[PDB]
């Protein structure tokens, strides 16, 4: 009955913007993946270094559950080795990532009639993110030789841009909620296991 709190991540009422992606450390529990297998919502359920059918048989030192909202045609960027605005500037997985990426369409929750603009992504950055880096800076991006002095201008852009989630948009531009489960094996004793 000490079930890992998957419902708190997958079913949280609010999800974070991808540039400010949330992370929940998960330990000292039995993870019941049945709730994931028995879900009809998921459009993406892809695992790396682990098999989706074998999850209930494996034990891990720690689990991290990262969550955020992106648009649908960007879910393909949540995978090892990817490029693009999301993978490079917002949320980056390492080449040797061990875990699963789960995504489902959340148009009924995260769009609204005039458009929902509360979800944002980082559009400009001086360098690519490192794996699992979270950059929440709102500092003006200097695209040119001219310094910006904290002010937007000709070659000085605010680094974040809103998604406009219109309920009538096509699915490629609809909001998708994403959970990334990363499974870390250290030499320490294990704390998270499925029903063996």
């Amino acid at each position, epitope marked *: 009955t000490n079930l890992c709190p998957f419902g708190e991540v997958f079913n949280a009422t609010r999800f974070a913007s991808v540039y400010a992606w949330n992370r929940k450390r998960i330990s000292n529990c039995v993870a019941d993946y*049945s709730v994931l*297998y*028995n879900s009809a919502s*998921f*459009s*993406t*359920f*892809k*695992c*790396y*270094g682990v*098999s*989706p*059918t*074998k999850l209930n048989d494996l034990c891990f030192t720690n689990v991290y559950a990262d969550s955020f909202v992106i648009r649908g045609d960007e879910v*393909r960027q949540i*995978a*090892p*080795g*990817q490029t693009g605005k999301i993978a490079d500037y917002n949320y980056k997985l*390492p*080449d*040797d*990532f061990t875990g699963c990426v789960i995504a489902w369409n959340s148009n009924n929750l995260d769009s609204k009639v005039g458009g929902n603009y509360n979800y944002l992504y980082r559009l400009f950055r001086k360098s690519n993110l490192k794996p699992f880096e979270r950059d929440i800076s709102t500092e003006i991006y200097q695209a040119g030789s001219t310094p910006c002095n904290g002010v937007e201008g000709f070659n000085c852009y605010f680094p974040l841009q809103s998604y406009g989630f219109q309920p009538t948009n096509g699915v490629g531009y609809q909001p998708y909620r994403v959970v990334v489960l990363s499974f870390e094996l250290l030499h320490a004793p294990a704390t998270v296991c499925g029903p063996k």
Partner: antibody
Amino acid sequence: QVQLQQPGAELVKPGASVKMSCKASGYTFITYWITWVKQRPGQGLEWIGDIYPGGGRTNYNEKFKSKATLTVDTSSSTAYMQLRSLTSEDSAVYYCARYDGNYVGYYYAMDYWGQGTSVTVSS
Amino acid sequence: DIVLTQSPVSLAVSLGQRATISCRASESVDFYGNSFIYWYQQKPGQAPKLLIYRASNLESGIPARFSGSGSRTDFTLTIHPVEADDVATYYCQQSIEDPRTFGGGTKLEIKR
């Protein structure tokens, strides 16, 4: 036009090595797994291993971890399998194919295939 | 290692008639309502072609003359009506556990 292209045939001396290519086109190479399968003349199919081209994670059949090494070159959208210390038992057709790995969709289904490289081990 | 056994090894069927090919798994391939069985068709000299995934789902572009059924250990590919260009060997594959394994194949011949 999704396409996987392999060289048709290779002749390689016993005890030597061979490296075979699988050139992908018509889709985003780094978002699909590439898998490799062995078919000995008149026999069924045998799974060799898989590689995810984004980052190059590999998974091997235990029977083939000493025989085969899978790599990719993402800049050329090409996957490679190297076979080491070849014997007559390695004479066969080797297929590359792709799968998307999505547990709620096609999963391990091989929807697109290369046409195979036929390897003859002879001196 | 799951062993898949296909019967019959060979099969002759007339045009318009029904061909049923069976695949038997040494262990259950059922996982939370899904049967992770795939069917492929291989004409001579060519790569296999995907027909069925998840034991009953038809790949797009494949005629509905092909159908997949079964559960747990026993699975079946059915071709009705059989046509002349169905001459091929048919293979089943499991992916519930690694290593993924294939059956030995069923060769289909047209009776004319």
